[PDB]
Design a protein around this ligand. Sequence first.
Ligand SMILES: [Mg+2]
Ligand SMILES: [Mg+2]
Ligand SMILES: [Mg+2]
Ligand SMILES: [Mg+2]
Ligand SMILES: [Mg+2]
Ligand SMILES: [Mg+2]
Ligand SMILES: [Mg+2]
Ligand SMILES: [Mg+2]
Ligand SMILES: [Mg+2]
Ligand SMILES: [Mg+2]
Ligand SMILES: [Mg+2]
Ligand SMILES: [Mg+2]
Ligand SMILES: [Mg+2]
Ligand SMILES: [Mg+2]
Ligand SMILES: [Mg+2]
Ligand SMILES: [Mg+2]
Ligand SMILES: [Mg+2]
Lengths: 147, 47, 121, 52, 186, 52, 125
Amino acid sequence: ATRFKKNRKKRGHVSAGHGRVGKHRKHPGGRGKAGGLHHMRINFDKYHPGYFGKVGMRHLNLLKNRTYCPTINVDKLWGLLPEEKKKEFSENKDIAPVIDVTRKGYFKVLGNGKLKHNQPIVVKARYFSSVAEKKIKAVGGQCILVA
Amino acid sequence: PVANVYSTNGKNVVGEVEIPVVFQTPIRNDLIQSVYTNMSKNRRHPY
Amino acid sequence: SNVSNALVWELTRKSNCFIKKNKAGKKGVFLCDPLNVNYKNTPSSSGLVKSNSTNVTLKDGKVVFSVKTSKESNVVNQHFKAKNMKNVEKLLQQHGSFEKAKNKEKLLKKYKRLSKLYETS
Amino acid sequence: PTKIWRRWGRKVNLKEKRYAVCSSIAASGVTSLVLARGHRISHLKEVPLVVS
Amino acid sequence: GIALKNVGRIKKHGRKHLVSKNPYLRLLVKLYNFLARRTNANFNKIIAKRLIMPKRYRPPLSLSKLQYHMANHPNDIAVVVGSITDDKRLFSLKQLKVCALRFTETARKRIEDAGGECLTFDQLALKYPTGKKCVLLRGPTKARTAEKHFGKAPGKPKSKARPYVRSKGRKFEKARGRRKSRAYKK
Amino acid sequence: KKLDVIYGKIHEKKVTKKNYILPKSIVHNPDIYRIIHSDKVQASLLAKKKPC
Amino acid sequence: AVKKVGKIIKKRTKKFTRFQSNRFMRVKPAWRKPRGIDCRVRRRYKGTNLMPSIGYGSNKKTKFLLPNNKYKYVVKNVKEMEPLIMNHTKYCVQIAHNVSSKKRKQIIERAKQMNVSVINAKARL
RNA sequence: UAAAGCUAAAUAUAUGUAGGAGACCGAUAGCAAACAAGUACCGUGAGGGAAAGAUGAAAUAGUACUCAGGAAUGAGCAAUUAAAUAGUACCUGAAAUCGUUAAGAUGGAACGGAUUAAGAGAGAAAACAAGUAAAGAGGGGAA
RNA sequence: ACGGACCAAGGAGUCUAGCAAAUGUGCAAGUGUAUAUGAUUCUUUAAACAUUUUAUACGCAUAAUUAAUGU
Ligand SMILES: [Mg+2]
Ligand SMILES: [Mg+2]
Ligand SMILES: [Mg+2]
Ligand SMILES: [Mg+2]
Ligand SMILES: [Mg+2]
Ligand SMILES: [Mg+2]
Ligand SMILES: [Mg+2]
Ligand SMILES: [Mg+2]
Ligand SMILES: [Mg+2]
Ligand SMILES: [Mg+2]
Ligand SMILES: [Mg+2]
Ligand SMILES: [Mg+2]
Ligand SMILES: [Mg+2]
Ligand SMILES: [Mg+2]
Ligand SMILES: [Mg+2]
Ligand SMILES: [Mg+2]
Ligand SMILES: [Mg+2]
């Protein structure tokens, strides 16, 4: 809203806040990203260090749907269950839950965190990591591969 | 807490109903005014 | 439980259909609401904020007596037709048990002032 | 020169809209607030005012 | 004349008043200013100050860290001037008593199912006027992402600051100035 | 009466607003001067002091 | 100079007129602050126009009182002057410029019955 | 399953024509043009291109008569209108610039800041008198 | 040293895209009902209201690192 703009405070002043000696002129240093590597070098180097040059191989026709893969850690793995359902399994001891994470939108199980001690759980997925699968085995569970 | 139901002649009380729980919302004039300023822009015509 | 006297004061400090301020002669601001004995814009004199109140007003030609005295949201607006000093004194005992003496002489003086106003036809 | 691609309207979150409507119904049930908006209701009995 | 610095006038630096126009918050500020003044307890002063700070200095606190902080303070009350959030990484919750400004629906439900209670600040002002057996806590104030861009500029030796980039990949700012293979690293 | 169904006090298909929760307050009771005058608070105050 | 009547003190009575407004007629007398190098008024040369400052301010206890020693209130109809029945010794009334004679007669007659003074009760007679 | 062919809908519309509308402009603004406007006028030619709205309710009230004067025009005891200092160049009618009368100043500029004095013009809302008593003229309230 | 014989009207940091910091508001491991469709919406309304009768549209966030197979 034009009511609150800064320029209205300079309305009786001569130079509109831009200076007697250095004016407000039009493009006194170039246009856009003009002078990089010549007279804008310091800015480019201290704020965007790796900007110039190229590195790596080409990939000519990508097709990103071939490698799409969302992940989930073992922490959030008991939290997919309702709390009253989580209560029942921790009470009884000869039953365990079987969870299929692909039905929830995850493809690869990943292994950060701590599973509950002596509480078996069976997990279905497309890919597993080594540490995640070890942690699932240690508490008495099992991993299953699906496609 | 209840409310009375008045007949269309304006004098008799012909029942009562229990006050709905929507009537306990916090009254917030700042929020109402701010939401109103944005919403009232949607019916303007261009020039 | 979503409202109190203090919250009602917070909502009606500035935006209100009874407030009047004078652009010229910068001193002063008034509340002209029906149950304001004075006309101060303070939480301790405004009829909308207080839970019990009494007042005397003209409102049409004659003089009218008003009571609020609503203590469980039973907002009751009793209006009585003041006639003379003795009747007003009787009504103050009848309905104004919650007032101090200090407020009662102020209301009586206000009534004595209001009784001197008249017009034609 | 004024143009037709000035942003004429705004988008408002749904939850805030609903919150404001709810807070505006609640204010309709306080006698003091209704009076201060300019309505002459010195002769009403109840401010919620339900009718058959 | 006379040789003073800042013409003898004392300087202060923080926030002085509320910016928010919420009437309930203004009622709270009035109440706790009164309590701090008439019972100078160093508990009411800090509270009266904290509920004026801007949003970035009232961070959320999760349930797991709340329980961890109160592990050696049974039958005490925790006081927070932010919001409490749920944590799906916890398996079980104890019985706790907590006062704060806001609770999320899931956290509020989980707290009450274990036998605890939630309080607002006008209830703690009424039952604990001087904060006896109350423990003040706050969440992380330097975990926001904006803070990862502050500090030494990215380009000085051994700086941890993130850069502002269009996107992320091998083609976006990784060649000259980021590896010894192109004229120098960092 | 429809106003209790609209906001989920009683549930009904195609009338109740889906998964909407009625908002909550940061103050339990906005009467601060009733809190100040209570005995518990009044017994913790300090004697009134003098101006200059 | 300083003018003092009772307890009311005015620190200055002359106005502040705009620099060079006596020499050019396109320059109006209303005060504007001089900006611009080499002015001789911005630089406080002796012998020229003075600038207004916060020092000339009035005592807070007597800031808006008229020589009547009361405050002024402007009314537009009979009903607007209701609040003056409680504070009739600290206020005086003035009638608005665009009210008719018929309305003015009523306003004056009520103001007399309330024991409040009217500043301009001689207009349109 | 190439080197032959056909096909509606969902899409676009600074043109032409008709209809509706706006937190738009208000006669130096808005289209160049609110009016005999792509007109008057300029250029050998391709082309360039303005200025210019308002008496009053009604003129089915637009100024009859007399005197002076060659006329134009002026004046009236004469005349329309609520109004002519609304008379057709007609609502209101600012500033620059000029006329008339009055009051002042005036030895190679004039205005000005501070402070007083001498003149001239206006002014009673603080810049005196509640109340009592006898009439006279009004206007309200209650039992 | 340059502009200024006088008066009236006009006359100059704005709009859109994209990013960030600050602050206010809502919800919170989530958040934002896209294009559409529905309705006993239809002067206003080109607004407002709704969401498909153990619930996989899409964006940003919830995980990094490497030229890369990948982990
Ligand atoms: Mg400056
Ligand atoms: Mg310049
Ligand atoms: Mg230079
Ligand atoms: Mg000094
Ligand atoms: Mg002055
Ligand atoms: Mg200089
Ligand atoms: Mg073919
Ligand atoms: Mg074809
Ligand atoms: Mg039109
Ligand atoms: Mg034009
Ligand atoms: Mg007339
Ligand atoms: Mg006219
Ligand atoms: Mg000479
Ligand atoms: Mg030059
Ligand atoms: Mg020149
Ligand atoms: Mg102008
Ligand atoms: Mg922000």
